[PDB]
Amino acid sequence: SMNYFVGNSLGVNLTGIEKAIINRLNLFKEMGRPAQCVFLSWNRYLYRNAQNYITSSDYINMYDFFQEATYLERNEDWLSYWTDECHYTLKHVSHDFRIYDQERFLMYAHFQDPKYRILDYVNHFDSQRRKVKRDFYDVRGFLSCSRILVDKQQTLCEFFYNPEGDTKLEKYFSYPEVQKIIVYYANKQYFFNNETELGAFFIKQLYQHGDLFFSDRNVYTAPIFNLTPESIPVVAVLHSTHIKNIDALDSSPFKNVYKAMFENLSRYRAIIVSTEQQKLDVEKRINHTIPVVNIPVGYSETIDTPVQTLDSVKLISVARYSPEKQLHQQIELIKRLVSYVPKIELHMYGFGSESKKLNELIQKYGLENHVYLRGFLSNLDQEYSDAYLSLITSNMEGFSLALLESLAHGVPVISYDIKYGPNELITSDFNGYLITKNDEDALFDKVKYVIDHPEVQQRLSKGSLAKAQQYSKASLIKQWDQFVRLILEHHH
Amino acid sequence: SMNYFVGNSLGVNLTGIEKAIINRLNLFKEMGRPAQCVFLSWNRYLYRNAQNYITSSDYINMYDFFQEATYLERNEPFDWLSYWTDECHYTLKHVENSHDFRIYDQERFLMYAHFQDPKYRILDYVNHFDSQRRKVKRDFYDVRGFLSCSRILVDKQQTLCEFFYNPEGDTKLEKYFSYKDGKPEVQKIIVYYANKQYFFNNETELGAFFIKQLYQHGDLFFSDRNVYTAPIFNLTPESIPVVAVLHSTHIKNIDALDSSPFKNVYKAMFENLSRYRAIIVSTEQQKLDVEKRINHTIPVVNIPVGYSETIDTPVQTLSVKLISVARYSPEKQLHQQIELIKRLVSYVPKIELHMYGFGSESKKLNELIQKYGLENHVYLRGFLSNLDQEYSDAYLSLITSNMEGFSLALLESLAHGVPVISYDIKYGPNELITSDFNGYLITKNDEDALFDKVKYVIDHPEVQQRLSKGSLAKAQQYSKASLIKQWDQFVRLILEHHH
C-alpha cells in the first residue's frame, strides 16, 4: 500500500510545500511505509530539479506517467549528428545555433550547457520563414513535446511523446486555453476537456485499494480530487493560515487556494495542520464536519556541531526579509541595547524585498559593527554555536523549521505571541519568552534580562534542548504512523 | 533493372494517360522486362482503384513508399462499431440518409464517423471535436484499413498541417500549409526515412527525393504526367535516364508549328530538353512535327499508345449504319454529321447514324435532330463501355473533328472491319487511315467533299468491302506483338546510348 503526496512540481528553488512533501516522504521511508511524491504540471526540467532531493523511483509526474517516462533516468552528440550524419551547417548566435541545409535555413537550436550535451529546444521554419513547430526536449534527453504554431506564433496544438517517439498525448487550444486532450493509454484513447479532468483520470489510474492520497497543493489538487470517487481516500494538508484575515476567525473567507477544498469538505477524510492552535481554529470554523489533526511539518535532527560555546553577545534572526517578519524592530531593539551592551551583535539570516530598507536603517543608526544582514545560508550549523538567543518579531507566523533547528542547538528564543508556530514551540520561562505582539518595550525588557543574567540564558538553553527533544524525528514518525493507520481503518 | 512509368494516380474512371501506363505495363510484363507504374499523389483509395487493373507489386505510390505501405494489400475486415460500443463504451447515433455515426461518451460529443459502405465495413474518415464542438482534427483511413493521414484544422476548418502514418501508427511525413487564393498550399514537408529526417519546401522536391531513392544503375524512367513529372525529373541528376512521353498535341496552336508556344503541361519538359533521353509520341505525324520543332536536339520516336486484338466475333454482318465514337464536345463537330444525314436521307432513307459518347453538346445535338426530323435516323447512344456488338453491322465510321489524337477507339473499330471517312486533321487520322485502303481523308471542314465521299461508299458496297478488308489489315499492323517489338527495341537502344 502506497502513500501519495500530491503537489504540482519542483522549482529551481524549492518552495515550502515542496520541501514539506519531500521531508514527509523521507519520514515514511524511514518508518517502513511506502511513499511517493505525485506531480502534475508538465515540466521537462523536473528530473533536474528532483536530482538533489529525491530519486526517480520516489515520484510520479502525470505527464511522465502517460509519456511512459516515470522512473526513467538521464540518457547518456547532436552536433556530430547534424554535421557528420546529416551534413547540415551551423551558424552560432548564446548557446544557440542556426541549422542550414546548404543554403536553406531549417531550424533554430537552443542548448543549456556550453558543452552542448543537453538540448533544450529546436524551432522549425517553413519556406517563407514561418515558425511552424517547436520541439521541446526533456533534460533526460528525449523529445518530450512538439508545439504547432499558427497566426502570430499562437499555440494551436501540442503533441507529447514517449522516449521512443510515440505520440501519447494531444492538446488542442483556442484563444490560449485547452479545449481538448487526447490520451493514448492502455491500448486505447481517452478524451478530456481540460487538465483538471486529466488529473482526475491520472489519480484513478494510480489508485489501488489500500493507498492514501494527500492533497498538498490544494489550489490544483482539490479540484482534481473533487472529480474522483469517494472510495479513493484523500487528506487535505494546509501549509499556511486557512483564512485571508486571521483576526476574523468566524467570518473571514477561506484563502483562494483553499476554497475548492473547504467547499467540498465531505470529500476529505481529514485536514492536517501544523499546530494545535491552528487545529482548534479550523475545527471550530468547520463545525467538526471532518477531523482536523495537528502534525508538525518537520522535526529536530540530531546535533552534529558544538553547542553553546559562548564568550560578544550574539543575537540571531532566521527569517525571510519580508514585511510580516517586521525585522526593523530588531534593529531598533539593538539601537536601544547597544548603550547597555557595547559588544552586542545581531545576525539576520534570510532574503527578500526588505534588504535595502533594512541595510539603510543600519547605516542610519551607525550599527554596521553590530547588525549584519547575512543573506541566505544553506548550512546554519556553525552559526548557532555562539548564538545567545533567537528573536521573532513577526506579526504572523507558521510552524518554523528554523526555530526547531535553533532550539535543537540550545538557542532560546524570545518571540511575539502571534499565530501560528510560537505557541507550539515556546513555553515562557522554559525555552524562552512569549511577548505581547508589537510590545517592543516588553521585548527590550526580556532580551535585556536574559543578557543581564547568563544563568537565566543557560537554564532557557536546557529548556530549548528539551523542547527540541519533544519534536524528535521518532515522535513525528509515530504521529504519522498512527494517523495513516487510523485514517485508513475508518475509511474501510 | 526496372522500367518505371511515372504518372500521378488512378481514378475510378481511368484517364487516357492512366490507361496508357497500364497498357504499357502489360506489354512489358508479356515481353519480360521488369516494369512498375509509379504514382505520386496521396490517394488513400488508390489500392481500390488499382485492383481491377494491376497487382500490388506492379506499382509504387510515393506516399505509400514513405508510409511503409508499398505492396501492402487489404486488411481483414474490422467492425469499428463493436469496438466503439463494446470496448470503448461510446454511444453511437446514426445519421439518417448516410453511412455515418455521431460518437458520444455519455453526453459529450466526441467524433463524427463516415463509412464508405452501408455495411459499415470500410471506415473512411473520423472527425474529432473539442469541448466547444470545434472540428479540430480529421482522421483519413486508407481503404486497406489503416489510418493514413490526420489533418489538423484551424479557423473555419482550414487545413493547417497533416501527419501521414505507417500502418502501425508511426508518423512518417508532415506537411504544413498556408493559404493562397482561398486554397491550402504546401509550405514545408518533413519526411522520416532511413532513420533520418529530411526537409522539403514542396511536393516537387519530395518527388525528386523519391525518384532518387528508386533509381539503381540500369533502371529507366518514363515521364508520363509531365505537368508534375517533368518538374520532378528536372530536380534529379542527368545520370538518371528519363524519357518524356507526350499524350496530346505538343503546342497550343497546331497551325503555327514553328512559333506556337508549347502547351502549359509540357512547358517544363520542353524548356529542359537536354534532361531527357528521348520523346515518345503516338503517331508518325507528330514525331515529324516535334523533331522539326526541337531541331532534332534529342531523339523523337513514335510508339502507339495501344494495340489491336484480332477479332473472333462476327464481323461485317451488314439499314445503312453510320457510326461516330466521339465525346460530345465542340472539337468533334458532331453537328456536321447531323447535317450530312439531313442531306443523305433523301438518297437513302434507310440510313442511320449512331453517335457513341457523352458531353456538354448533347442538348444542342438533340435540338438539331428534332429540328431536321431525324429522330428515326440519328441516335445519341450515350456512353457504351463495350462497343463490340455495335461494330458488327456498322457500314462506316465518321470523323468530323477539327483536332484529334491517336484513337484506340478507332483502332478497335478497324479491328472489327469498319472503314472510316475522316477530316485530315492532326493527329491520329493519318496514322490509322490510308486513302482508298481502309477509308478516306477529307480536307478539313469540307462538308461537301464529306457528303460526296460518304455517298460514294454507300453507292458502292464493293468499295466498302474492299475498305473493310483494308481496315482489318490496317489494325493488324498494331498487334500486341508489333508493339512489344517496338518497346523492346526502344528500351534496348536508349540504355545502350545512356551507358
Author numbering:
A (entry chain B): 0 to 75, 78 to 94, 97 to 178, 183 to 318, 321 to 501
B (entry chain A): 0 to 317, 321 to 501
Published text:
Despite the biological significance of these two glycosyltransferases involved in pathogenicity and avoidance of the host innate immune response, their structures and the molecular basis of their activity have not been investigated. This study reports the crystal structures of SdgB and SdgA from S. aureus as well as multiple structures of SdgB in complex with its substrates (for example UDP, N-acetylglucosamine or SDR peptides), products (glycosylated SDR peptides) or phosphate ions. SdgB undergoes dynamic changes in its structure such as a transition from an open to a closed conformation upon ligand binding and takes diverse forms, both as a homodimer and as a heterodimer with SdgA. We found that SdgB and SdgA have a unique inserted domain, which is used to form a homodimer or heterodimer of SdgB and SdgA.
